Every structure is written in structure tokens, then in C-alpha cells.
Amino acid sequence: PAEVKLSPRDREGIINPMYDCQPAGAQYAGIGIKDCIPLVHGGQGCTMFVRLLFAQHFKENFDVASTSLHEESAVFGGAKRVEEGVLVLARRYPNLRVIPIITTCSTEVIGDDIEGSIRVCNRALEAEFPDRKIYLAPVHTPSFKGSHVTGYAECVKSVFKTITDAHGKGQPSGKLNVFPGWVNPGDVVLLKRYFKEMDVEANIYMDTEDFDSPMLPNKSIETHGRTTVEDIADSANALATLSLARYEGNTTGELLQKTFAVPNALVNTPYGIKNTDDMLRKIAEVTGKEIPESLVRERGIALDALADLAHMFFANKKVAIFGHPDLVLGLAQFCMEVELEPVLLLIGDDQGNKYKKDPRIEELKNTAHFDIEIVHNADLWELEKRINAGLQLDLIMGHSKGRYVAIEANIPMVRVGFPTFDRAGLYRKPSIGYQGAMELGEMIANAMFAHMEYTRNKEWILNTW
Amino acid sequence: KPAEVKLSPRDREGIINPMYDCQPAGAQYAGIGIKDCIPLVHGGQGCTMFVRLLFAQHFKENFDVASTSLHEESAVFGGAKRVEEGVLVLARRYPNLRVIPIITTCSTEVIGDDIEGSIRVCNRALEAEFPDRKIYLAPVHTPSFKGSHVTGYAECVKSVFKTITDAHGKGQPSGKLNVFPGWVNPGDVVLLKRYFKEMDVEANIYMDTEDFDSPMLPNKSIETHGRTTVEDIADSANALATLSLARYEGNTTGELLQKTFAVPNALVNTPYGIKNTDDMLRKIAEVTGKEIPESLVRERGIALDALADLAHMFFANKKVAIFGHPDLVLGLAQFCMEVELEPVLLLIGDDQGNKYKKDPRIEELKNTAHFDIEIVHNADLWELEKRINAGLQLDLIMGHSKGRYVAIEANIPMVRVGFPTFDRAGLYRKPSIGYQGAMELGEMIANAMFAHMEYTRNKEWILNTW
Amino acid sequence: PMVLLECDKDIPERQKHIYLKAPNEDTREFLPIANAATIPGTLSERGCAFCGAKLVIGGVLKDTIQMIHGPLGCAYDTWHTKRYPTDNGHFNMKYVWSTDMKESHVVFGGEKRLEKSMHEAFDEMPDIKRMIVYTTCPTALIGDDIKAVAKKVMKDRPDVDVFTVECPGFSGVSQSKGHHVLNIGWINEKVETMEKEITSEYTMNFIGDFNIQGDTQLLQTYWDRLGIQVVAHFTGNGTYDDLRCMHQAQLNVVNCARSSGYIANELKKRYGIPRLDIDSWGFNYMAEGIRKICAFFGIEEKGEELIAEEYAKWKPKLDWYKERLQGKKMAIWTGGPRLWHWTKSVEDDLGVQVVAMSSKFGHEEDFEKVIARGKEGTYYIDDGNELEFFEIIDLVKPDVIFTGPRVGELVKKLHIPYVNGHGYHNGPYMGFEGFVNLARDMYNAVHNPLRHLAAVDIRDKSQTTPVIVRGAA
């Protein structure tokens, strides 16, 4: 009677949304580009609340501007607000090179002609700044479909289309393109090390390592995306694209394959051991480079650590996971590797028709020995209501906006995905790869250990494990 | 009335809840960091087996240590034959064995076995039986009724270095630093190796325990070994300088190499916190003539950025108790004050108070603290529990896992530091020293406080927009 | 004079929004423009009208569903961002509700989607019988009539009460418009729709306090000591039904005249309840406020007992901080009122010099107040933007900035510490004890070893790493 079931939320309304709207994800894509300030065409909250969200996750400022739609534009249209906003950015930020122009619910409803405004601004900018090139990318992100996951993917794709349309195909680079998806600076640091150890040249899109910026003696601000116009333009010239996230950048890898014949390889997001193994095998396949001994060792260190935990503390423990779909599906596989039982997976948006075709669902259906409920179009009330109805969980894995569910239910909780504002430093700690699997497993154990102490549940057992 | 930093002894003769183990345990720890070494603990069997268990608790790994298996007969009539047989049984069964620290215990110190005489007997016997091997037998005098595992670690390092360098002497200058980090984790070794690599400084780290965190490999090979070789130890006579990070955990070996071989020894504050790391790097630059790299300015800046998110918001005016090895207690007290924590109670666990009173870091604390600090020497962990019972208000404890029940029952968040940290996972892989270590310590403190705020419903809504 | 900053050379209209107060000026000739349109593309700090209604005022209530009629982003964005505790387990911070508007609702209308969401919310939490419904950008644009839906829901479900607010984010110029729409609808529709027991000879409402880190609960210890019944708090630690009773009060005490003056003005017009403006931040300000309240009620001696005890408890600590904060330079970059509630109170009580102030959404009224209380040589900025903030820092070199966390994280790179001027560091900040809390955070922010450490370049042979000696009150 062994069943992995997909079902939608049974309510029309949302209580406690899992994700933000599309424009928020588009902003996140854009802030990873060097010399980029996204321009969010709509009311002011659509910008300011997202700048706050990024400050909650990263404890850093990121620059995003608004077009400040007001009442007159709601009656007569807002094109003049886009056009002014572009010029005001260009005039006041002399080094600015890229402006994704991100629509919102308001500006999608009223039908402002973004591409027409871009033609006006391109003419104005070419006349006023003859020796400057600014790339204006139209990003259509109505908030009444999809989520910040879809908006991220749409913005990446539009920026890549815009910049590669301008520069076309040149000389082969010998590099990989890599789209890790929506990951932390620590995940980017880990991937750079993997490619360096395997002697593989690669651009990671976007390179967000420097979001964790120093406080320096010279008072310099280094909190920038490192992916440049040049880096994005060179994507046309790659040997191949490695796409780690079906819902977070694969569509850009496909676009580069259609436009420039750069072959795209979509792999399972590298959460856990097998998914990391298979990612490295694909890298080896496409580059002809061997997997280095250093990665065999990191893998073995991870396995050694996880083996201290799995049958002692994890076996038969019931887990709920929520977050981005690539993360939820990848973490469910990781959980199984360490004998955890992910019985409830919650995915937070209207993309169920795609999720039903995800091959990882089938990988779960063919492996799990316990029922799995996958709730799509889920909110976080879907988790709280199921706990209130009697679902027994030993662990929750998810982002910080679910914290009160775990706190009130007295269930230990590991913070994963976005945003993780209610713990310190998690943006620096990998979750993907071998090291990431080890770090995740040790977070899980340490959360369980503290819970055993606070609840006096065999707390004496933490001596000779 | 100005703040006072007061040193006081435990007021009881007995111990309740000892902070440290005995000298032989620390000597065993020193020895397991040497490649092709199996320490031989001359005494009853518990003196070995309980310490192998202790290392398994901290590291979740096996380490090889042997016993001489003192029994009744040898306790009454002398244990030399047990030493001598144990050495030969080791050599016969472990063909790659090169170093045997012969570690005394309370029993074999009380009965007065002549360890140096047994070593002469064994050298004779080994030279005849194995004419193509050289095995280094180091006499390690570690009566457990003096000192602690801290002093026993320092004594074993010094005796092994004396033994090996006596045999090899001084030769070709190596151009390397000797580095004695003291009793630290594998993650601390990993950080130091990176610092030296980024500063283009060749160095031997004594002992190199990185590989204690060993992989589970496809070929089933066992790589859980110390990496410091005989050759590494012998080369200490040829170094440009010694950098000693721990006054109580290896500086006496630096001093012996200075006296014997004219290798200048530089003792610095143990590098817990920002200033102590800065000053260690300044000393390395002075002795080597090498610049501090930009990469370390950046790591320092990332640490400061992280700690600035925590200090005035969550840490200011919070009261801390710290216990552990003396170099770690004094260094963590300095780190705490950099981040606005107030370390009001420092507990150091052995009879070395005559040395602690002269520690320059005590004066550094006297000159900075704006709050009273009690430094209890010869402390046990009952000295902490009793003070809490009498009304000491603490917001945080920093110490090793054998103090866990104090924190649990008092409902005080604790961060696990020092040795052993068996009741949390992976801590041996985390640095505590250096810039990255300061950041990871500060974030452990914050995350422990954050969980405590949730469990106790103490303004748990505040963890949103800090 | 009015100031044209270098970063505003291509947006020179900004000069009429920035006043540098100079000796002998007639300030009436130099009042910033305020509450005017934003310039696109500036990185203004402003938010939207919906924020002002739901996040700032309505969402404070402890027992009310906050139904945001729109796509899910507006709801997500106003959840896990405020610090207004309650005495019922923080219901207000744990939950947010959306109608999850989809494309089909843009095409065909969202009224049935709202109605369904509303009944679901009441069904999921059967103990909750009160709701506020808010419009957002697209539900305003398609003309959904949320008042009509709410009317039907109340007819169909007679044990619930629903209030509605039209507050799409493009309305007005800032969050200010949301305040106004909410205030006026509440007094028009819901005041005097129930009554409560009167248990004191002395009654008041406290208008314009949102219980940031428990501010309202701290002030309530004063009212309870003085034997004053608070009919309603607008809206800190409040309830929907208490707000229906506001007409019963003898006196309206106002702190936030910006967000909440509207309903105090209408309560005076309609019910004759006098409006008393106070400052509930500031040590000596709090004493003035208590004395006014007690003079109005004729309980002066009870006021003087409370003041005496509070000064005995807290004044020595306040004065310890004043000794160490005297002469420090401060900037305040917040919504508006805290500029005029803090500039002179930190000067009087802590010796702190406020050298620059920026208001996101203040009106000309707020500028009148702040310039009346503020210093010469200080910059007064309406609707400041990020590049202006950098130029102002170079001009006035503050020792500390009271602002939101994101800006605090930006100025940290320049080694300038911050205190959260919105949600506080370690509050509450109102009242006698609260000003001591504010002073403690300011002290720990500025006299912080990490700031000194950050300035040291370890590569400079010439530099050492210092130690600083701190203190505690």
C-alpha cells in the first residue's frame, strides 16, 4: 500500500504564503549582476518590501529602484515613470550597465508597453551618453501567476536574451555555463572549489559569493554581484551548459541551446550524495576531465560523518520539507540516504502541471517505503493544519517564515532555502554537494540534540554515540 | 569601586566533577598525533582503555594506544618486565611502528619503575631482533597526582621532541617555522595551514591532526593517523623560528629547542578573537619577513561584518562563564569582550595557579574589564554549579561537554568549546581560532541564544529584522 | 538655506526638499516640500499606501484576520517584518492572509474569490470573528467592491464583523495615504457600534501607538497606577471591538499625530473629546505628558508620586549614559514623527546632537515640528534617497544612525553603527525606562570594539590593534 501522492491545496485562499511573487524573484536574479540596478515598474512597496526581504536573509543592502507608480499613471498609463526612472538611474550611477525592467501586477494589468519604453530610453541614452552602453531587459512578471521561483527564472532568461542578442556568438571559450539556481553564497563557494579541483573553467550564473562582503579598513563597499555583462555574453561561446535546477534557470540553458547550439545538461539539483555524484559524472562526461581524488575524499568525510548519525538518531524519524521545488525534491532524496522519512513535501505555487512530470517524483515513488504526500500550490497553513489534525513529525526543514509552526508544535527545525533570517550565518554554509550534505546532516542532529536536552528526552544518551 | 579581576583557588580539598583528565591522558593525546606511533601506557589497563574511549567520544574515531597491563604481581615486585614485553609485542606485531612514548601512570610512579633503564634494555633487545629498524622510545613521566592532562600533553610533546632531536641533532637549515598550536581541533589545524599557505610561509604544525577526521573510502583504507613524522620532528632543530600559540600546551618545547639548537621561540597569545589573531600574524610577518596577504584582511573583514550583526543587539551586557584549558579560557575571555560579552567567571581546572597568576593575559583583562571577573584556579565543575545555585546570573556558558548537565538543569544556553565536545556533531571540524573561528564562535553563541529564546518564549518574535 | 546636493545635480527639484538650518533664518521661508510625488529611479525609501493601512495600523490588532485582497506578494511582504507583541501569543505576527488572486480573477473579477477566502479564514480559525479586508494594486484596478462583499459575508455569517480599506499601493505617494483612508473609514463606520463597561472616573483613548517591542504595555503600567481606564489603544496590543468603543473616552492622548491625528480630530468634531498631543518618547517629555493627563483629570498628586518613583528608579542610569553620550552626533532616517519626538529629547536628556534627519513620508506639518525643535547646522530632508544619505554622511559625519536594518547594514561598511529607529534594538523605547533602553543601545552601538578593530589594516607595519575600555550604567 506504498504511495507517493500529489495533491493541490484544497482552499482558494492562502494563509502564510511559502513564496513571494514573481517580481521579487526577478529582483533576486538581477542583484547578482555586477553594475546592475533592477527597476521595478509598479507601486513602491513592490521594491521596498523586497529590499527588506534581502536584508533579512543576507544582512546586507542591495540596490533596486522603483518607478513609483502613482494615481495619475493608474488612469493614463505609466510609461513616463519607466522612462524617467531609467534616465534618473543612468544620470546618477555612472558605472551602471544593466537595468532589468521588472513589471508588477499593476503594470501588467494596465498594459504599459515596456518594449516601447525601452526603444525610447535606448535612443535617449545613446544621445546623452555616446560612450556608454546600458542594457535594458524587459522582464514580464505578473504576480497573479507563478511565484518568485518563476520570476527568478524569467529574469535570468530575459537578461541573457538581451545581452547575447547584442553580442552574438564569437570564439569558443572552452568554459561551462553553470546555472545553480537560487542558492546561497556558500553553495557558490563550494561549486567554485569543485570546478577548480576538477580543472574545469566555468562561469556560475549568478556569482553571489561577494554578497557576504567584508567590513574593510578602507570603508569600501564590495557587496555586489560578480557576474558581468562580458561573462553573460560569453555564455553563447560555452562548451556546454550545466543546469542544476529545473525551475531556476534550466529554461536559460535551453534558450542558449536553441539560439547558439550550446548543449544543455539538466541534472538533479545536487542535494545529497547520489545527486552530487551524478552532477560530477555529467561534468566529467561533457568536459572529458576526470573526477579528482580530492572529491572522493570530501565525499568520504561526508559519509563518515553521516554514518555517525543515520541509524542511531535519524532512522524512522518523520520529516516535513518546504521550500523551492528543486530544493524540496533534492532534500527528500538526501533525507532518504540518511534513513530519514520525508512524509510531507510542500511546494508553494501553481506549477503542479510541471511538478507532476518531474522525474524525481518517480525516483521517490520507486524508493519510498512510507507514504509521501506532496502538496503543491501549498501554503504554510497546510503544514500547521496537518500537525493540528494529528500528523506526527520529528523534524521540519524549511525557511524562517515557517518558524512559528515548529516553535509552537515543539518540533525541531532546520533552516534551509530562502529566507533564513532567524539564524546567523546560514548563507555562508553550503547545503549542496558532499560538504553541504554533511553540514545539513549535522544541523539536523544538533537540532535534535538540543531538543532532547530542552525536553529531557533521553538527554543522557548524547555521551557515547 | 572599580571593577576587580580576582584569582582564587577552589576552597575544597576534594573534587566534584573534574574539569580535566590526568597527565597520562594528555600524553596519550600528544602521541596519537604522530605518524607510526603507538603510545604505551605503563600502568593498569583502565589508564589506557578509558582514554581511548574519551578520544572516541570527542572525535568519533578509534586511536591506537597500548597498555603494559600492570597486574598484582608487577605492582608488588616491579613492572619493568611488563614495559619491556609490551615494547617487543608492539614492535613484533606492528612492522611500521617507529615511535613509542612510554607514559607512566600513578601506579608506576609510586612503585618507582626505572623507565630509562627499561628503555636501555628494550633498545638492546630491539637492535638485536630488528637490526634494520629504528624505534624511538621516549620516557614520559606523567604521575597523575600532579598537574592534569594539560601538563601531560606538554610533557609528552617535550619528551618526544627531546628524544628524536637527541638522535638526529642539528643539520641543514630548513627555512620553515615550527608551530605548536597546542591542544586544538582538526579544524583549527586546517585554518592554520591555510593561513601559512596564503602568507607563503613554510611551516610544520606539531602535531598535525587534520587526518583525525578521516574518510570512509571506497577501498576500505584506514587513514585516521597523525601526520607528524619522525622526520618532521627531527627537522624542528633546523627551523627559522618557533611560533608557540599556547603557554601551557607546547611553549616549553619551543623553549627547549631555543636552548638546545638556538631556534628562537616566539610565544604569542593563543589566537582566539580578532586582536590575538592580528598579533599572531604580525609575529609571523616579523620572523619570516613575509607580508600579511590581502586574503587575510578579507577574512578578517568578513568575520567583523558577521560579528557586528550580533554584538550590540544580542551580546552586550550578557554575562558569560568559561571553562576549559587555560590558554582557551583566557583567549575566549578576550574574544568575548571584543563582541561586548562580559566573561564574569573563568574556571581553570588544575594545580598550576603559580603560573596562571603570572600570565600576561590576566593583566590584559584587569586593564580592560568594566565588570568584576572571578578566575577560579584548581576549579572543578561543581565550582560552577554551586555558584549558579547561590544566585550567579549567567546568560551563557562556554565549555566542554562534561559540563552539559550544569547548563541543561540551570536552563542556560551553552556553546561547546575545547575538549571533549562529544554531545554535539561535527565540532572538531569547525575552527575556533583565527578570524573564521571567531566568526563561527560568535555565530554559535547567537544561534544558541536564538534557540533558547524560542524554547523559553523570550521575545522570540525579535528574530525577524535584526 | 535650501540645499542642492552634488548627487542631485540632474534632479535639481530635490533642492526644495532639503533644508540646512542657518542662523537668523525665518524658517517659514524654508519649509521643505513634503508629501509630494516621488521621483522615479531615485532609491527613495518610500513604501506604499497598503503598507500604511495593513502593516502599520490594522495589523497590530491581536484578534483580527488581515485579509489582503490581491496576489500573494503583498501578503508575503507584510509578514515576519514587524515587532508588535501581544498578550495573546502574538497572533498578529504569526499569520497573514491572501486571496491568492490569479489571472482568471483579473479577467472575470475577484469578488467571489475574496468571499470564498473570507469564509475559509473564519472556518479555519473558529475563535476569530473579526476581519479587516484590504485592497491592493490590481484589485483596485479591476474594481472589486470589497465593501459589498464584506456586507454579504456579515449578512450570511451574523457572528462576524468586517471592516474594509481601499488602499492600492499607487494611491497617494507613500504609506501616508493608507493611514488616512483607514482612520476615516473606521470613525465613519465602526466607532459607536458597541459599548463597554466604564470602570473608572477617568477614561481615555491612547491614539497613535503601535506597541513596538511592548511600548504600549509599558505605558499601560502608568495608566493602571494612576487609575485611568483606557477605553481603546489605537492600535497597540489592541482589539477590534475596543476600537468600536472609542466614543466613550473623556480624553484622547495622541503620540503619533501623523498616522492617527485624523481619528483624534474626527473624535473631537463628532463627540467633543479633546485631543492632547504628547511625546511618549523622551524622559522629561514623558513627565510633561503624565502631568498634563493628570491635570486634565484632577489627579495631580498621583502623577507626582509616579514621576518621583520613576525618576528615582531610572534617572541615575539615564544620567550615566548622558555623561558618555554627550556631544555624540546622531542621524535619524525614519518615517517622520520620530524626528520631532527625538531631536530635542536626545539633546536634553542625553546630550546628543542630531545633525541630519530624513522623513520618508512626513507632511509639511511634521517639518514644522522638527525644524521648530531641531538644531542649527542640521539637515532636514523630505523623501531622502540612498545617494543623498552618502553625501549627508560625508557632510555631518554622524557617530550613530537611527534607521531601518537595511540602511544600518549599508552604513556598517563605512564603520558607522546603527540603532533600529523603527523596530528598536532592545526595546521598548517609550516611557522613562524606555529612554534608558534607547540610551543603552546607543551607547553599546557607538562604544563598540568591532568599529575600532575594523579600522585597523593589519598590513600596515605602523599600526597596532587597540583595546577599548567600555562601561555599564
Ligand code: CLF
Ligand atoms: S505597491 Fe504585491 S508585491 Fe507588488 S507585484 Fe503586486 S503582488 Fe507582488 Fe503595495 S499594494 Fe502590493 S506591495 Fe506592491 S503590489 Fe501594490
Ligand code: CLF
Ligand atoms: S588502572 Fe583503573 S583507571 Fe587506571 S589509575 Fe588504576 S584504578 Fe584508575 Fe587513574 S589517576 Fe590517571 S586514570 Fe590511571 S594514571 Fe592513575
Ligand SMILES: [Mg+2]
Ligand atoms: Mg569520522
Ligand SMILES: [Mg+2]
Ligand atoms: Mg554581512
Ligand SMILES: [S]
Ligand atoms: S512611505
